[PDB]
């Protein structure tokens, strides 16, 4: 998968 | 990293902290379920160029997530190690994917052009030149490749090349590298920050690609541009290696 951190930086 | 942006959430789950035999903390990034990229340089600390993979592999200690210790089977070096500065570490088993631990995707597209911005994490030193007690991160713009070339050496044309490097040692600068500018607030990336990935978040398709890995982590305060080796250029090489 790409692009799905549980809590991104933003 | 000397300046700020404490890593509160763990927004960078693919960052691994590998410590060499003499307690030197260094960055490595988890590139897929079984493998993590790093630099040939990082691999070669406290070892001779004579040393081969079998020699180097048992020496290292590696950490993912918080303290999480993943073991390490073999080690493979880029055939151009002295020019393209890249290793690969294969982990003895799989790592459980979850919110804090998870590999990064290798990019198909190439975002090397100036005007883009990226995010570099790091475990490296700070403005007290202490190894940081907690992982941090910083945003950096990408810098004009010519300004960077003329910056670190003198030339363009290879016969006028001279060691203009603000620090003692000269960085590797070729067609497989790109340079990232200085911060907005003049923050930069120092000892220990090699092997961390220059990760650009693509907002339309919302994915974080690793465009480059940081090679030259010496620049710190003194040298206006950090320099990364594009991962896209080792694309077709890493795939060949994954099959073994």
């Amino acid at each position: 998968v790409c692009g799905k951190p549980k809590n991104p930086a933003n | 990293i000397l300046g700020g942006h404490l890593d509160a959430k763990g927004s960078f789950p693919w960052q691994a902290k590998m410590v060499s035999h003499h307690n030197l903390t260094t960055g490595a990034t988890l590139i897929n379920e079984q493998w993590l990229l790093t630099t040939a340089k990082n691999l070669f600390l406290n070892h001779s160029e004579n040393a081969t993979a079998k020699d180097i592999a048992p020496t290292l200690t590696l950490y993912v997530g918080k303290k999480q210790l993943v073991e390490i089977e073999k080690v493979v070096l880029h055939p151009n190690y002295s020019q393209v500065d890249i290793g690969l570490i294969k982990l003895k088993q799989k790592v459980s994917v979850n919110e804090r631990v998870m590999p990064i995707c290798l990019p198909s597209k190439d975002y090397a052009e100036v005007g883009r911005v990226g995010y570099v994490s790091g475990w490296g030193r700070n403005a007290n030149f202490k190894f940081t007690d907690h992982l941090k991160y910083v945003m950096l713009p990408v810098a004009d490749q010519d300004q960077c070339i003329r910056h670190y050496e003198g030339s363009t044309v290879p016969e006028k090349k001279t060691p203009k490097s603000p620090v003692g040692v000269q960085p590797i600068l070729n067609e497989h590298t790109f340079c990232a500018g200085m911060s907005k607030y003049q923050e930069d990336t120092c000892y220990g920050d090699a092997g961390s990935a220059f990760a650009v978040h693509d907002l339309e398709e919302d994915t974080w690609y690793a465009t480059g890995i940081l090679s030259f982590d010496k620049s710190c305060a003194v040298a206006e541009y950090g320099v990364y080796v594009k991962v896209t250029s080792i694309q077709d090489w890493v795939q060949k290696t994954i099959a073994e």
Partner: protein, 141 residues
């Protein structure tokens, strides 16, 4: 990153130090052994007592090195190369210590020269000692 402004400031401030550069260099050293006893593990055979002649002279050396660096400051690492290799490899000095001595040198110089330390100068002085302590450290591996 040492802009023209910084460089000018550092020169103008380090001039007003003049011949006193040596004794401050030594006073600074004294503080580290008193403040941070671990740095003493690099100087086993030195007499570490108050105002020791050995301390005073080593301080005169580090002072003169610094004055040399600032005399032609636009290429410092060539000038300091042999000290790069001397501290990096032979002595293997742990990079935190340069930032220690940097700070002791700023407090000491502050104490003795109150009138010139307006913030801009404290800034470019800290940058200057940063840039140097890096260049000495930058051949570490």
């Amino acid at each position: 990153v040492l802009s023209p402004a910084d460089k000018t400031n550092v020169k103008a401030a380090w001039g007003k130090v003049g011949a006193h550069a040596g004794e401050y260099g030594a006073e600074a050293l004294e503080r580290m052994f008193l403040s941070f006893p671990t740095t003493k593990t690099y100087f086993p055979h030195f007499d570490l007592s108050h105002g020791s002649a050995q301390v005073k002279g080593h301080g005169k050396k580090v002072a003169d090195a610094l004055t040399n660096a600032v005399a032609h400051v636009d290429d410092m690492p060539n000038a300091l190369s042999a000290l790069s290799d001397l501290h990096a490899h032979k002595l293997r000095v742990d990079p935190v210590n340069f930032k220690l001595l940097s700070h002791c040198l700023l407090v000491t110089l502050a104490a003795h020269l109150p009138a010139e330390f307006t913030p801009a100068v404290h800034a470019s002085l800290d940058k200057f000692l940063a840039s140097v302590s890096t260049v000495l450290t930058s051949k570490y591996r």
